[PDB]
């Protein structure tokens, strides 16, 4: 009386394998590779609705210069102080950049104008930066082409001896951040396969069996890359550099663990003495729903990542959801199918370890007789991670997370040798009216604003019409609208503008301008103050909010999904709750590893990205035990806990180790942010696999007893039987 | 009839030593 689903997989396994092979071939041929597709679908990482972004966009609209919000700078570094020859060479580049209207919308030339020549030029006079607006916003595929084209123009010229141009910008750095993830994506795949291959050899103690596991992983990875690229090519949705790397890495790890679950259970069934036919059905029956629930749990976590204010997360959750569905579909279909066929040809999948687990016998026993003592020890482990919370902090500049080989980094380092970070990102305040301000009466107020703005602390030079370098008609052209209805103030900060102090300066600058405009026709003017400092701040407000929303929403969905499968309200609550404790300890370890040991603080995006993966993957490991506990709970709850630990011993440990190593394998990436995400997720898996899975969860179930599975009524122990002969 | 507190200290002595060592390391480094 075999069920239709497992029987159909075994009986028609051969055509099923061909079907998946056919699907993979079409995806990788019709649609280009995921790396090529990802570049075309590069989603903008800068929110358009950001007040700083809107103000900068409005500046061009008011001044009839541009409409974008991205403006990189080119540092024409020279060995000697730049003369007329270099300036003429610089002037020729200005015409060439303005000629390329496809990528350049406006050029904010300051060195060419003697009024603001000193501001753009270096203190030593050997270098100068020019702010050139590039089509597209930060992260957009058009912007990436725009950055290359502007940099191409800088390269495509006969530079004077000793003079070299260096294009620098956050958008340029973001564009280069895409390449580093894409270039290392193949390298990460190569390292990931090597680590997985060694672990399979160690765990299974066989060579033929190791190739069997690798074969299923290759099918999943190839299919996962194709469909995500397939949808991307037809503009179904965009792709994030982080999403592309995460989709590949998560797909590899998810498929491998699913393979271990099937083979581990199958070998466990084989060790019981069952025949090959029965063991296959036993494997499928006891693991399909667990694997199915794991896929839904991962899919739910990925889906929740779409409900974010930040476009980077909003455009990342859906690609993650699509990629994981293929792996779950492939594992549930190809997994049983491949095992059915390969087990026929030779004794390959049959076990070779032939080793019982006295360690899990002793560990499980301790958790039963003295659950409280074990539970207290489990609690102590969680408390350790919380010690690093007060010292936790994050930085925002991405140049820290990119290697020096990046061309933007080379320009970034070159600029600082003669300029300052304040000159790199001088924030802009625009005072817009509907009335012409090209009159002495308005000039007195505008100068009064300039005096007021400079009075604000933390401001170096308020570069404007009345203050060309913070201290005439060209300034009107530079710092006022063509109709004269507005005026802009290039605000140069003191020290590091990209700091919380710079944001506080904005409020002071706004009020000081508000006081100056008060009592004048400017009292009805519109003030538009924005810059790079506010742009980073806008991300954090979105990041902080989206961190709470997605984490909270994911827990609710996981609670529902686990409750549906486990059919127990109390049991489902324990599974979700224990994972939350693990992340508290998991997060602390990541902070200690980078901030205090390595000395490189975690990126602000690291925490939101790691939370979803840790919650989803961590919950799956507990479900494996809990589902096993429900099967074995009939012969006493205390005994059932012992057998469940023995039944799922090194099986989950091997699966946990593989997943931890796959995330750890991300460290080979040149981009540190990719590595930091892998380490943060990887470290969490080790704690959950060892502490939460083996100690915290079994101890709680012992204490609760019948209450653990409520409302599904269970007995603490069955009816005592008589002693057999 | 051994009391729980001394029995727990004796039975699980090994983890306790590790915990205090770990705490000191965090304080000294962080």
DSSP, residue by residue, A259-305: HHHHHHHHHHHHHTT--HHHHHHHHHHHHHHHHHHHHHHHHHHHHHT
Using DSSP's 3-state secondary structure scheme, residue A310 falls into coil
CA dihedral A548, A552, A554, A558 (to 10 degrees): 160
Angle between helices A170-204 and A141-155 (to 10 degrees): 110
With CB atoms and an 8 Å threshold, state whether A592 touches B30.
yes
Which helix (H) or strand (E) segment holds residue A587: the answer is: helix A569-591
CB neighbourhood size of A165 (10 A): 23
Which alpha helices (H) appear in A343-468, and where do they start and end? Answer: 358-369, 371-385, 407-416, 421-424, 440-455
Tell whether B20 is within 8 A of chain A (Cβ): no
Q: Which residues of A367-395 are buried (b: 16+ CB within 10 A; e: fewer)?
A: bbebbebbbebbeebbebbebbeeebeee
The position carrying tokens 């900060």 is A493
CB neighbourhood size of A168 (10 A): 24
With CB atoms and an 8 Å threshold, state whether A380 touches B11.
no
Smallest CA–CA distance from A390 into chain B, residue? B30
Tell whether B17 is within 8 A of chain A (Cβ): no
Tell whether A377 is within 8 A of chain B (Cβ): yes
CB neighbourhood size of A293 (10 A): 20
- Alpha carbon of B29: minimum distance to chain A alpha carbons (Å): 7
With CB atoms and an 8 Å threshold, state whether A387 touches B30.
yes
* Distance separating alpha carbons of residues A591 and A402, to the nearest angstrom: 19
Smallest CA–CA distance from B5 into chain A, residue? A373
DSSP, residue by residue, A400-412: GGS-TTSHHHHHH
With CB atoms and an 8 Å threshold, state whether A380 touches B12.
no
Which among A320, A315, A329 is positioned nearest to A299, based on CA atoms? A320
What is the distance between the terminal CA atoms of chain A, rounded to a whole angstrom?
35
With CB atoms and an 8 Å threshold, state whether B26 touches A373.
no
Residue among A376, A380, A388 whose CB faces B26 most closely: A388
Question: What are the structure tokens assigned to A60, written together?
Answer: 């061009």
Residue among B8, B19, B29 whose CB faces A380 most closely: B19
CA dihedral A493, A494, A497, A502 (to 10 degrees): -80
Pairing assessment for the beta strands A104-108 and A129-134 based on DSSP bridges: antiparallel
Experimental method: cryo-EM
**In chain A, positions 390-409, which contact chain B (CB-CB < 8 Å)?**
391
Which among A378, A381, A360, A293 is positioned nearest to A701, based on CA atoms? A378
Question: What are the structure tokens assigned to A584, written together?
Answer: 């508290």
- Alpha carbon of B1: minimum distance to chain A alpha carbons (Å): 15
A81 near A69, Cβ under 8 Å? no
Which among A122, A173, A589, A581 is positioned nearest to A404, based on CA atoms? A173
> What is the CB-side half-sphere exposure of residue A565 using CA atoms within 13 A?
30
Pairing assessment for the beta strands A459-463 and A486-493 based on DSSP bridges: antiparallel
* Distance separating alpha carbons of residues A595 and A588, to the nearest angstrom: 10
A306 near A314, Cβ under 8 Å? yes
With CB atoms and an 8 Å threshold, state whether A384 touches B22.
yes
Residues of A in contact with B29 (CB under 8 A): 592, 596-597
A512 near A452, Cβ under 8 Å? yes
In A170-273, the DSSP E strands lie at: none
A445 near A148, Cβ under 8 Å? no
Quick one: CA dihedral A60, A65, A67, A68, positive or negative? negative
With CB atoms and an 8 Å threshold, state whether B15 touches A377.
yes
Q: Residue A394 — φ and ψ, nearest 5°? A: -135, 145
What is the distance between the terminal CA atoms of chain B, rounded to a whole angstrom?
43
């Amino acid at each position: 009386p075999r069920p239709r689903l497992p029987w159909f997989l075994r009986t028609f396994a051969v055509p099923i394998i061909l079907a998946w092979v056919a699907v993979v071939a079409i995806l990788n041929t019709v649609v280009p590779t995921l790396d090529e597709v990802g570049e075309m679908r590069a989603v903008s990482m800068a929110p358009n609705d950001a007040p700083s972004t809107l103000a900068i966009k409005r500046v061009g609209q008011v001044f009839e210069e541009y409409d974008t919000s991205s403006s990189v700078m080119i540092v024409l570094e020279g060995e000697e102080p730049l003369g007329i020859e270099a300036h003429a060479f610089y002037d020729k580049m200005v015409a060439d950049l303005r000629a390329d209207t496809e990528h350049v919308q406006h050029v904010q030339d300051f060195w060419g104008d003697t009024l603001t020549a000193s501001g753009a030029q270096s203190v030593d006079g050997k270098a100068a930066y020019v702010q050139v607006y590039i089509a597209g916003d930060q992260g957009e595929s058009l912007a990436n082409e725009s950055v290359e084209a502007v940099r191409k123009i800088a390269t495509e010229r006969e530079t004077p001896s000793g003079v070299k141009a260096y294009v620098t910008g956050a958008a340029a750095t973001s564009a280069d951040q895409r390449a580093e993830g894409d270039a290392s994506m193949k390298l990460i795949e190569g390292v990931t396969f090597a680590v997985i291959t060694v672990m399979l050899l160690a765990v299974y103690r066989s060579v033929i069996t190791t190739l069997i596991v690798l074969a299923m992983v290759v099918l999943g990875l190839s299919g996962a890359r194709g469909i995500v690229a397939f949808l991307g090519f037809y503009n179904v949705f965009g792709l994030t550099t982080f999403a592309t790397n995460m989709v590949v890495t998560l797909a590899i790890a998810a498929a491998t663990d699913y393979a271990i679950f099937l083979i581990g259970r199958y070998q466990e069934a084989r060790r019981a003495g069952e025949d090959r036919e029965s063991a296959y059905y036993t494997m499928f029956h006891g693991t399909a729903h667990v694997v199915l629930a794991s896929g839904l749990t991962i899919a739910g976590a990925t889906l929740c990542l779409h409900f974010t204010r930040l476009p980077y997360f909003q455009t990342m959750g859906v690609p993650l959801a699509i990629g994981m569905l293929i792996v779950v579909a492939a594992a549930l279909t190809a997994g049983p199918a491949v095992i059915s066929v390969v087990s026929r040809f030779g004794k390959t999948l049959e076990p070779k370890r032939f080793s019982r687990s006295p360690g899990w016998h002793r560990v499980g026993t301790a958790t039963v007789r003295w659950p409280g003592a074990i539970l207290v020890c489990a609690v102590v482990a969680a408390l350790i991670g919380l010690l690093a919370l007060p010292g936790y902090y994050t930085t925002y500049d991405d140049r820290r997370y990119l290697p020096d080989d990046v061309p933007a980094n080379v320009g970034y380092d070159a600029a600082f040798r003669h300029f300052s970070q304040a000159k790199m990102n001088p924030d802009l305040m625009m005072v817009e009216t509907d009335r012409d301000l090209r009159n002495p009466a308005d000039f007195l107020v505008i100068d009064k604003i300039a005096k007021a703005l400079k009075n604000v602390h933390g401001i170096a030079q308020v570069q404007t019409i009345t203050r060309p370098d913070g201290d005439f008609q060209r300034g009107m052209k530079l710092f006022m609208s063509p109709d004269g209805h507005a005026v802009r103030f290039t605000i140069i900060h003191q020290g590091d503008p990209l700091t919380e102090e710079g944001t506080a300066r904005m409020d002071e600058l706004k009020v000081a301008a508000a006081d100056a405009i008060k009592g004048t026709p400017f009292e009805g003017a519109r003030i538009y103050l924005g810059g790079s400092a506010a742009t980073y701040n806008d991300m954090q407000i979105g990041a902080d909010y989206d961190l709470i929303i997605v984490a909270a929403s994911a827990l609710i969905l996981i609670f529902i999904i686990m409750m549906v499968l486990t059919r127990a309200v109390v049991a489902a609550a324990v599974i979700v709750g224990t994972v939350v404790l693990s992340l508290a300890s998991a997060f602390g370890l990541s902070v200690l590893l980078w901030q205090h040991i390595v000395g490189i603080p975690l990126h602000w995006m690291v925490l939101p990205m790691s939370v979803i993966v840790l919650l989803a993957v961590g919950a799956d490991y507990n479900l494996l035990l809990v589902s096993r506990m429900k099967e074995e709970i009939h012969a006493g709850i205390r005994t059932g806990i012992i057998r469940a630990m023995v039944g799922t011993g090194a099986v989950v440990t091997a699966a946990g180790l593989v997943f931890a190593f796959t995330m750890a394998s991300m460290a080979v990436s040149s981009l540190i942010t990719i590595g930091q995400v892998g380490t943060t997720i990887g470290l969490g898996l080790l704690f959950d696999t060892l502490v939460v899975r083996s100690l915290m969860t079994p101890s709680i179930a012992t204490l609760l007893g019948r209450w653990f599975w409520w409302p599904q009524r269970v007995r603490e122990r069955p009816v005592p039987s008589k002693w057999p002969t």
